[PDB]
Design a protein around this ligand. Sequence first.
Ligand SMILES: Nc1ccn([C@@H]2O[C@H](COP(=O)(O)O[C@@]3(C(=O)O)C[C@@H](O)[C@@H](O)[C@@H]([C@H](O)CO)O3)[C@@H](O)[C@H]2O)c(=O)n1
Ligand SMILES: Nc1ccn([C@@H]2O[C@H](COP(=O)(O)O[C@@]3(C(=O)O)C[C@@H](O)[C@@H](O)[C@@H]([C@H](O)CO)O3)[C@@H](O)[C@H]2O)c(=O)n1
Lengths: 130, 128
Amino acid sequence: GRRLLTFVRDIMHTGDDTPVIGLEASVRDALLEMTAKKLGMTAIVDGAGTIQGVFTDGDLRRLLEKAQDIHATPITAVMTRSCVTVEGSLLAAEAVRIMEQKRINALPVVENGRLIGAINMHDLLRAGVL
Amino acid sequence: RLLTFVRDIMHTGDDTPVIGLEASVRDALLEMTAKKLGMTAIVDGAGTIQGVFTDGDLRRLLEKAQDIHATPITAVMTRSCVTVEGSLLAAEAVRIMEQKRINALPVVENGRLIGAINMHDLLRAGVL
Ligand SMILES: Nc1ccn([C@@H]2O[C@H](COP(=O)(O)O[C@@]3(C(=O)O)C[C@@H](O)[C@@H](O)[C@@H]([C@H](O)CO)O3)[C@@H](O)[C@H]2O)c(=O)n1
Ligand SMILES: Nc1ccn([C@@H]2O[C@H](COP(=O)(O)O[C@@]3(C(=O)O)C[C@@H](O)[C@@H](O)[C@@H]([C@H](O)CO)O3)[C@@H](O)[C@H]2O)c(=O)n1
């Protein structure tokens, strides 16, 4: 039988492994954070830790189609504000459906708007999860 | 209806993201965007795969370069790229992507590019 139920909070990246920058960050800051946390994206939060947006590798491509010399560009000018988030109590099986339906690759995990971690497609494809 | 193998589910023909060896990074961006897979393949004139370039590659490039539009794709592409044959079971393409921590696969026959597939294609086809 199915051994145990897997929720997003069980396999999300948390603490210092969460990719996160503030509203004052630049695109350069975003790149460095994206690279460091290995999820292909970063969240952006306000001073209270509330999620304000995300910026993905795909977002970078789209930016580079319209701008050059982007290292000092404020993250707020280029991020996705109406981003998709999930609660930690979501089933992993539910999350994978959301990635498919919304055509995205990673999810910030939140509680009351407050960022608590992140997952991506590869977390959901781990052995035994689905 | 038939969705067993990679060849069944891949983007193929003109839906494949592909540019030639002579292309620039600007050409790569346009193609990456147009075909919606977050990557492009690079082929020689004969249609043989020479490399790939992904959205993650672009991040890594932007960490060490600026003003990249005119840069030749050969200078930044991944040459030793992972490829699959069309005869791969679709479930096995998922397993490769997971184990290798990659997000799309060019499909080949003896190095000749025939298509490309990513995780979203597999999800949409009911593979998982
Ligand atoms: N939790 C999330 C994750 C992503 N997004 C937004 O959704 C859009 C699509 O996300 P993406 O990660 O950029 O999606 C891409 C894309 O560029 O569209 C990336 C690309 O590498 C490739 O993986 C393709 C897939 O082939 C699916 O289209 O998908 C982006 O504007 C992003 O900021 C969001 O609102 N909330
Ligand atoms: N068929 C392929 C596909 C990709 N690659 C190469 O594999 C490397 C990783 O591919 P990526 O798509 O850039 O992979 C990323 C990356 O940035 O490394 C993207 C990011 O969304 C995220 O999915 C992370 C994983 O989360 C890391 O575990 O993976 C790249 O240099 C790419 O050229 C390859 O050789 N052959």
